[PDB]
Amino acid sequence: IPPPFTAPYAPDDAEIAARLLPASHLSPPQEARIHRTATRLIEAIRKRRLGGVEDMLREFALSTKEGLALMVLAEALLRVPDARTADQFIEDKLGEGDFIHHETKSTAFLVNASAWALRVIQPGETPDGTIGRLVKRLGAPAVRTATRQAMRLMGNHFVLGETIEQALERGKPRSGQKTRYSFDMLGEGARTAADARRYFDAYASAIETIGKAAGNHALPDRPGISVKLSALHPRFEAISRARVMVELVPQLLDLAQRAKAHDLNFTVDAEEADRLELSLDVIAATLADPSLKGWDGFGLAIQAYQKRASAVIDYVDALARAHDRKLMVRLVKGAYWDTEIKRAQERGLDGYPVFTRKAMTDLNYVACASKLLALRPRIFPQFATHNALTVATVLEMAEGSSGFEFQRLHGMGEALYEQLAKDHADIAYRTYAPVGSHRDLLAYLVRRLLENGANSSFVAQAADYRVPVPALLQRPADAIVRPQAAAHPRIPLPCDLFAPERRNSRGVEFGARTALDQLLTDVKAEIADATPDQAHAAVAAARAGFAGWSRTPAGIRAAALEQAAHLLESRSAHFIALLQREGGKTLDDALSELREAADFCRYYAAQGRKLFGSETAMPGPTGESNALTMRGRGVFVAISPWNFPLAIFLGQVTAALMAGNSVVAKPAEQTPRIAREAVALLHEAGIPKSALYLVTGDGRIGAALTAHPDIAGVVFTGSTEVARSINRALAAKDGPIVPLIAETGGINAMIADATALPEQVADDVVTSAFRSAGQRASALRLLFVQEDVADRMIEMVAGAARELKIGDPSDVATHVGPVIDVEAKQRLDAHIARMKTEARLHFAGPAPEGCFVAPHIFELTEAGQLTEEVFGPILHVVRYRPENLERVLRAIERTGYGLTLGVHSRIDDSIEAIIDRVQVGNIYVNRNMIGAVVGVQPFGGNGLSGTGPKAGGPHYLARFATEQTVTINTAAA
Amino acid sequence: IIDRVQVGNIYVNRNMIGAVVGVQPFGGNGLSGTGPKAGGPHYLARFATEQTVTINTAAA
Ligand SMILES: Cc1cc2c(cc1C)N(C[C@H](O)[C@H](O)[C@H](O)COP(=O)(O)OP(=O)(O)OC[C@H]1O[C@@H](n3cnc4c(N)ncnc43)[C@H](O)[C@@H]1O)c1[nH]c(=O)[nH]c(=O)c1N2
Numbered sequence A: 001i002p003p004p005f006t007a008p009y010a011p012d013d014a015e016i017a018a019r020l021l022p023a024s025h026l027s028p029p030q031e032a033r034i035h036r037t038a039t040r041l042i043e044a045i046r047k048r049r050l051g052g053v054e055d056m057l058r059e060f061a062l063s064t065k066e067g068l069a070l071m072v073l074a075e076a077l078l079r080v081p082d083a084r085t086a087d088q089f090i091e092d093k094l095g096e097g098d099f100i101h102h103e104t105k106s107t108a109f110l111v112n113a114s115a116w117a118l119r120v121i122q123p124g125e126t127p128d129g130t131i132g133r134l135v136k137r138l139g140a141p142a143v144r145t146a147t148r149q150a151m152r153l154m155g156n157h158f159v160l161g162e163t164i165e166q167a168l169e170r171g172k173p174r175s176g177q178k179t180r181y182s183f184d185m186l187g188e189g190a191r192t193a194a195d196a197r198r199y200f201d202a203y204a205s206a207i208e209t210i211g212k213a214a215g216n217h218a219l220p221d222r223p224g225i226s227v228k229l230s231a232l233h234p235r236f237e238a239i240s241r242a243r244v245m246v247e248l249v250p251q252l253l254d255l256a257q258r259a260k261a262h263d264l265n266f267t268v269d270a271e272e273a274d275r276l277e278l279s280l281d282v283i284a285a286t287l288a289d290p291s292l293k294g295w296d297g298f299g300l301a302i303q304a305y306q307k308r309a310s311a312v313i314d315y316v317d318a319l320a321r322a323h324d325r326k327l328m329v330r331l332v333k334g335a336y337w338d339t340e341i342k343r344a345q346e347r348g349l350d351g352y353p354v355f356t357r358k359a360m361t362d363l364n365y366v367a368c369a370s371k372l373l374a375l376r377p378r379i380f381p382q383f384a385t386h387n388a389l390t391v392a393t394v395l396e397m398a399e400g401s402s403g404f405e406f407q408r409l410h411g412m413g414e415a416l417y418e419q420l421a422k423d424h425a426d427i428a429y430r431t432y433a434p435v436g437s438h439r440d441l442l443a444y445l446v447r448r449l450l451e452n453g454a455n456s457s458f459v460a461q462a463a464d465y466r467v468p469v470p471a472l473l474q475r476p477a478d479a480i481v482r483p484q485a486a487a488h489p490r491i492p493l494p495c496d497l498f499a500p501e502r503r504n505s506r507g508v509e510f511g512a513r514t515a516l517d518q519l520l521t522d523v524k525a526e527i528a529d530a531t532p533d534q535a536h537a538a539v540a541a542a543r544a545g546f547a548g549w550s551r552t553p554a555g556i557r558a559a560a561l562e563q564a565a566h567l568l569e570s571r572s573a574h575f576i577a578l579l580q581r582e583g584g585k586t587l588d589d590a591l592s593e594l595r596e597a598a599d600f601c602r603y604y605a606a607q608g609r610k611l612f613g614s615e616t617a618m619p620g621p622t623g624e625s626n627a628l629t630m631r632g633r634g635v636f637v638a639i640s641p642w643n644f645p646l647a648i649f650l651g652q653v654t655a656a657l658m659a660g661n662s663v664v665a666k667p668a669e670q671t672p673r674i675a676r677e678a679v680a681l682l683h684e685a686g687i688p689k690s691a692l693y694l695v696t697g698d699g700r701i702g703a704a705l706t707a708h709p710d711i712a713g714v715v716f717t718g719s720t721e722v723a724r725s726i727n728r729a730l731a732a733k734d735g736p737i738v739p740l741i742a743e744t745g746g747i748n749a750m751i752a753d754a755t756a757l758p759e760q761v762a763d764d765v766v767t768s769a770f771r772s773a774g775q776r777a778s779a780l781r782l783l784f785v786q787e788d789v790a791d792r793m794i795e796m797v798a799g800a801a802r803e804l805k806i807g808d809p810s811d812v813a814t815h816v817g818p819v820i821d822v823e824a825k826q827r828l829d830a831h832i833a834r835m836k837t838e839a840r841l842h843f844a845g846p847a848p849e850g851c852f853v854a855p856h857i858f859e860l861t862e863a864g865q866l867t868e869e870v871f872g873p874i875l876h877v878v879r880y881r882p883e884n885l886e887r888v889l890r891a892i893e894r895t896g897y898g899l900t901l902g903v904h905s906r907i908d909d910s911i912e913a914i915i916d917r918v919q920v921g922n923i924y925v926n927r928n929m930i931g932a933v934v935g936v937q938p939f940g941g942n943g944l945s946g947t948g949p950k951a952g953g954p955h956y957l958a959r960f961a962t963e964q965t966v967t968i969n970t971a972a973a
Numbered sequence B: 001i002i003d004r005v006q007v008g009n010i011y012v013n014r015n016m017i018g019a020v021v022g023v024q025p026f027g028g029n030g031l032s033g034t035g036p037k038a039g040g041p042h043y044l045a046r047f048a049t050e051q052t053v054t055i056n057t058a059a060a
């Protein structure tokens, strides 16, 4: 038995290309046969009458969003009982008006079949929505034609139903016949326990349907089924490995046994790169069961676009050797390329787990295919591709043998593989059809549309007559030529995302067991109050250090911040441990705050050089110079919260310091130890002792600091009430009117309409409301959801919220740590008890013994029932009618807050109408509302949410400074 | 003198009056006021509030 798979996550592309490039060399007569095969295949592709997705996209010059909208509308129209009824609709209503209504209803239909029944259309309606913009661009008649073509595609290439039973009934062959295709089951990412059971039953149900229609031939000439591990477990993630191995393995085994009893091909699909190791763990434990001996149909997909692909092949082979099994192994290039790039950047990884040049994937795919062909007969390879060149090359390397197959998706590669079958009679290819229910269509269509709409896609190019046939025949090695060119030149490494402005902080990929274990190990390996006199002395000492710090050159202040960033990341294990023990933060939140703290230092340093590093020359008359500068104001008092006790503490403090002010810093009572370490670190990084003082204690000590007549400003993050009293104590003084910078939370809403993917809304609602136990100023408090999808969305949020593990934040599996202290928990439980008597309850999770509040979900009759920011894991939901979006926006305006706002919608015109109407500081569209990144999402809002300027943005530092104009009459010279 | 004082408008070897818009941004600190300087590049922003719009474009 091989040890648990653990290859390097993102090794260097050049070293890989240095081996693959010389080894790709094929002999001249080999390459000529490849050229001819692929030419004949492409000529058949260009024969041209069954259309495809890519054909529809190209014909009407549709974006992927527009393709999606029409295919969803098409699916809804196909399920209207009377075809003549759908035709009347297409002619008389579609494109005439009600554009957003048609897009909303047809999408709601996928989760709520009763949502749509076929109002009346007034003429002259402004064409908005995805459909309306399509009508303005192409004209209503072309939209009707494109919709009719989408209906043919949806009916011919998908096997769908309102439930899996209906899909399987529709995809059933005539009694006594074998199915002419294998089942690529729709379904991914269970969000709820019921989801995981439902997909399990769909798979078991599908295995019986194809089992009964399987023929009398032996493998490989029998139908197959494809399943996703993420569909079978609601927290399929590396940090939940322990429950995954206990719960998922028996499930996958049960389905594998049912597959074996019909002698089927049973294939585990390959998903995102951070699930690779977990999937192999689950697959290894499942294959190990002796009940699966004597059956040759078990297998998995392997993604060639991963640098680890070749090692996965070795691992799978040693598995088959160790258990004396035969496996069927599918080689694909990979369906998640864009996701892997984005994820690596967001996560600050030291590289990409995938190649970044298409030819490198194509090169690695052929190398992996050659490796798999040599592992026959123990490995039966399945080459799933619609690339005529890839097919031609793989066929040549097999040298005319058997013991393998090609694979395609229904609606793609048909002309390719028919021609291959004509020219080489012994070639087998497996055709999969997508099979599933409407509630799984949207998520699937999104991914399918990305590959078909891609410019680099082979099937898209081989069908565009503008692309000459010889262009599609360039061999991958000839496009790369040299190893140093393996990486794509226009995609920086995550560490270079902000170059040359500044460096980026490093993150950790939790789906790489070596990385997660090293971090867990490092972290495991790791104050009297101030009298009013000592706080008074602190101001006086900061006041005395101001002059020298103010006149220290900006580049030296900036160097100190950059060295502070260096020390934070070098000592990340220490601060993470402090964030877990003192802050109560889970490991993902602690790492993220540590990164944010370093990001604040480097960002304010770079801004600091631009702003205070040199003077701005003003135009003016000759004989006279005019120069504008900015300089420190004096002593800033910085008051910081307990919920970001390191990053907001350091953002506020280093901003004031960078602008040339000395600082007296008063941390939250609950988290002084992290603040002491941070202050000590800034001193060590070069902040003079006289420029920065820490004063710990109560709100009376915070009041004494902000009431002190010698301070030049206050930077404060906390509650509205305390900011007002600070503001009043400042206004009460007879001295100068000094700046107050305040961020004071929000009652943050999210608006989700029926065009949004309900499983993405659910993910983002669960994250935004319950991550960090809701102890974030940015957290989602109030979800507005359109009534046609409200039931499904609320139930999915509740089921997902139920799978959150609440407990000790040091345990790797914890999703929800404790709230900060007993007093906070008491405030939250009081609001929970009040909401139970006042509003509908949807979920009240079980809290472990101790200082914990569990996720809660309440539904309100009106938004007005929620009158306070409640700083915990407590979501409130209002369902609304689409014609009442104005009442939603008025409710959001009525709270007086304006920090974050989430918008989930496919419809650009709706998104824009919301953005135009609200004043909220941070609007997040089709993603969660939390974790603003320094210099990426400048963070902060208005109204009762605070004053600005936004932290982590280009207007922040100036507010800590005052301007100076120097005008010199130079005429004497 | 310039290094020592915090005064908003320093006029060297000329009179101290008649600031020109966009040439001598006018305004100071302490009991002379809050800023930002009138007729300079930091004035208009203070009358405004910032907005960040973050769109997950990956669906496209
Ligand atoms: C029967 C069957 C079953 C499956 C799959 C396909 C089929 C036919 N796939 C999908 C597969 O991985 C792939 O996305 C499509 O088949 C298209 O790839 P081709 O070889 O057809 O075409 P094509 O040759 O046009 O290749 C496209 C691929 O190149 C890669 N690519 C594009 N740009 C790149 C760049 N700049 N740098 C590096 N690489 C780049 C991407 O992987 C992209 O998908 C899959 N996928 C998966 O991840 N898990 C799975 O289990 C399956 N299962």
Ligand code: PRO
Pocket: A234, A235, A236, A237
């Ligand atoms: O996609 C993932 O890996 C995690 C698992 C549950 C939610 N997101």
Ligand code: PRO
Pocket: A641, A642, A643, A717, A718, A719, A744, A745, A777, A871
């Ligand atoms: O905004 C804050 O940081 C505190 C925490 C609970 C209430 N206000």
Ligand code: PRO
Pocket: A776, A777, A778, A779, A929, A930, A931, A932, A939
């Ligand atoms: O964006 C977030 O979630 C936190 C809250 C204050 C700023 N950063």
Ligand code: PRO
Pocket: A630, A739, A958, A959, A960, A961, A962, A963, B034, B035, B036, B037, B042, B046
């Ligand atoms: O406090 C402010 O807003 C001014 C504007 C420019 C410099 N500081």
Ligand code: PRO
Pocket: B016, B017, B018, B019, B026
């Ligand atoms: O510069 C001056 O003389 C006047 C005083 C206020 C602004 N303009």
Ligand code: PRO
Pocket: A947, A948, A949, A950, A955, A959, B045, B046, B047, B048, B049, B050
């Ligand atoms: O009051 C201020 O200074 C903020 C900063 C940019 C817009 N207004």
